[PDB]
Amino acid sequence: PMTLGYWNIRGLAHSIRLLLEYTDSSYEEKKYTMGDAPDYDRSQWLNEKFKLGLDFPNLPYLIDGTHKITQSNAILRYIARKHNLCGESEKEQIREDILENQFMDSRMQLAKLCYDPDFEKLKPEYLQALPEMLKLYSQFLGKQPWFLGDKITFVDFIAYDVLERNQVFEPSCLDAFPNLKDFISRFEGLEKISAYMKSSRFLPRPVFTKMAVWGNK
Amino acid sequence: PMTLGYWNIRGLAHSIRLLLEYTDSSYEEKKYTMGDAPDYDRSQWLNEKFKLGLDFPNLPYLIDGTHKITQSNAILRYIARKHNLCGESEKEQIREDILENQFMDSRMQLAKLCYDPDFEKLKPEYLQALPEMLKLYSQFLGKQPWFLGDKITFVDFIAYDVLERNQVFEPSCLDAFPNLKDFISRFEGLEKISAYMKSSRFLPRPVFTKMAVWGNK
Numbered sequence: 408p409m410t411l412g413y414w415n416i417r418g419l420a421h422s423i424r425l426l427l428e429y430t431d432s433s434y435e436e437k438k439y440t441m442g443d444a445p446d447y448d449r450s451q452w453l454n455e456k457f458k459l460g461l462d463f464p465n466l467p468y469l470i471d472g473t474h475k476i477t478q479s480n481a482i483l484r485y486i487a488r489k490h491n492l493c494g495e496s497e498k499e500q501i502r503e504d505i506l507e508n509q510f511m512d513s514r515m516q517l518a519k520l521c522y523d524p525d526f527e528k529l530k531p532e533y534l535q536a537l538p539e540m541l542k543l544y545s546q547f548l549g550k551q552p553w554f555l556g557d558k559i560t561f562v563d564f565i566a567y568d569v570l571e572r573n574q575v576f577e578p579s580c581l582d583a584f585p586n587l588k589d590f591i592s593r594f595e596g597l598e599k600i601s602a603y604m605k606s607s608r609f610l611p612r613p614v615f616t617k618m619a620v621w622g623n624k
Numbered sequence: 625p626m627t628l629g630y631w632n633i634r635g636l637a638h639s640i641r642l643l644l645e646y647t648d649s650s651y652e653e654k655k656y657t658m659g660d661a662p663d664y665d666r667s668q669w670l671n672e673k674f675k676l677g678l679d680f681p682n683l684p685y686l687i688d689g690t691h692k693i694t695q696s697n698a699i700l701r702y703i704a705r706k707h708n709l710c711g712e713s714e715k716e717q718i719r720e721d722i723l724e725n726q727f728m729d730s731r732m733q734l735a736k737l738c739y740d741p742d743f744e745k746l747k748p749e750y751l752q753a754l755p756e757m758l759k760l761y762s763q764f765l766g767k768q769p770w771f772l773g774d775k776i777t778f779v780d781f782i783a784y785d786v787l788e789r790n791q792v793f794e795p796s797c798l799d800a801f802p803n804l805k806d807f808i809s810r811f812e813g814l815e816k817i818s819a820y821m822k823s824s825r826f827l828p829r830p831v832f833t834k835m836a837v838w839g840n841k
């Protein structure tokens with residue numbers, strides 16, 4: 408009944424699919440397929456972009472009855488509130504807002520690099536900064552199981568996605584940060600997550616679109 | 625007592641300053657000055673970036689007692705919650721999330737264009753896509769005085785900033801969308817807003833940093 412639309416890519420829908428599975432949401436998925444170079448045909452999307460009742464037609468989108476949602480973060484927040492997977496105290500909401508935005512910034516830095524035709528020249532640059540970036544997240548998590556404390560929340564589904572895809576970009580990057588390694592194990596070990604990661608539905612790759620220099624397959 | 629730190633620029637702090645003034649917040653500003661070309665010295669910032677108690681050192685930042693916050697959206701949400709300027713119903717929260725994100729996307733599109741050395745070559749396309757963007761926000765707002773309905777909320781502060789800077793980018797852009805024009809006048813006519821816009825604290829220019837090809841002054 409619920410419908411998640413997005414490319415046949417991990418990208419921005421990863422955290423979402425994971426949240427939908429963790430919350431036991433009843434949903435199905437509409438996967439749009441982009442053609443290959445040099446056109447990268449998007450007609451499969453464009454042909455019904457403005458025919459879905461979306462206020463701001465975009466990918467990913469979530470259609471839950473009367474609620475038609477765009478913007479990944481908004482889609483996550485919607486499902487999160489629906490299952491009380493949100494920060495409660497003021498301190499938890501602050502950390503929740505800071506993280507939601509920080510991780511998106513980090514997500515975009517990697518995407519920017521990977522889509523750039525000068526990926527090879529720019530990559531060293533990114534690798535140099537990775538330890539510093541990871542360290543801030545590591546310090547923030549500290550001895551806590553989840554980014555907001557004792558309860559798992561939606562930022563954890565985001566945290567997971569960007570931290571893990573960095574692990575696949577540079578496998579050794581998390582070695583110096585035990586807690587982030589444990590975060591990833593802790594998350595993948597969750598009952599509903601583990602089961603889903605074994606199913607056919609699980610789509611960890613490709614990370615990006617066919618337009619990427621890295622992660623395109 | 626409350627401290628807002630940012631560049632001596634409009635940029636991301638515009639909506640924040642406007643929201644602090646509207647809520648009658650007791651605050652002072654820490655303005656960092658960037659040097660000019662070709663090095664664009666940022667030492668004024670770098671010299672204390674890691675000495676402020678910030679978890680993820682960044683600009684803008686808000687220091688409110690024990691609360692040290694980064695990420696413009698998070699600072700806005702923080703102030704908004706403190707004065708009940710948030711969406712209440714589920715429908716309003718969804719619209720609030722979608723807009724916060726949609727406006728940020730539009731904000732970055734303009735920034736990307738304005739900092740790119742190929743500004744003149746790229747401007748034309750941006751101008752060609754601007755009506756479509758504006759139209760979506762127009763339709764969404766409809767006959768409502770504010771973006772979420774009857775009550776003014778923080779996304780309106782975001783909305784104002786990005787729609788307005790576009791008006792300064794392309795004066796006639798809002799002409800075909802009366803409701804957006806009225807929204808700007810409506811917001812600028814707000815008692816606390818109007819008074820602040822007449823004071824010395826008002827900083828509508830420069831839109832961007834010295835590094836921009838447009839709005840650098």
Ligand SMILES: N[C@@H](CCC(=O)N[C@@H](CSSC[C@H](NC(=O)CC[C@H](N)C(=O)O)C(=O)NCC(=O)O)C(=O)NCC(=O)O)C(=O)O
Pocket residue numbers: 417418419464465466467477478479480514515518519522523614615616725729
């Ligand atoms: N803010 C929105 C972004 C939505 C968006 O941009 N959607 C794209 C697909 S994301 S797929 C493309 C995206 N690309 C990038 O992040 C790189 C873009 C940069 N500007 C560059 O080209 O260098 C990506 O890979 N993202 C995944 C990730 O980083 O996790 C789309 O096709 N939208 C409908 C339309 O445009 O018609 C959200 O969070 O939902």
Ligand SMILES: N[C@@H](CCC(=O)N[C@@H](CSSC[C@H](NC(=O)CC[C@H](N)C(=O)O)C(=O)NCC(=O)O)C(=O)NCC(=O)O)C(=O)O
Pocket residue numbers: 508512634635636681682683684694695696697731732735736739740832833
């Ligand atoms: N997501 C963060 C962004 C914070 C940020 O990037 N801050 C900058 C200043 S923004 S000032 C720079 C930003 N530049 C851009 O948006 C253009 C970026 C492009 N990639 C390019 O450089 O060509 C801008 O003008 N933004 C304003 C707007 O669009 O309204 C900084 O100096 N941070 C501390 C540090 O980096 O050490 C937030 O919302 O707070």
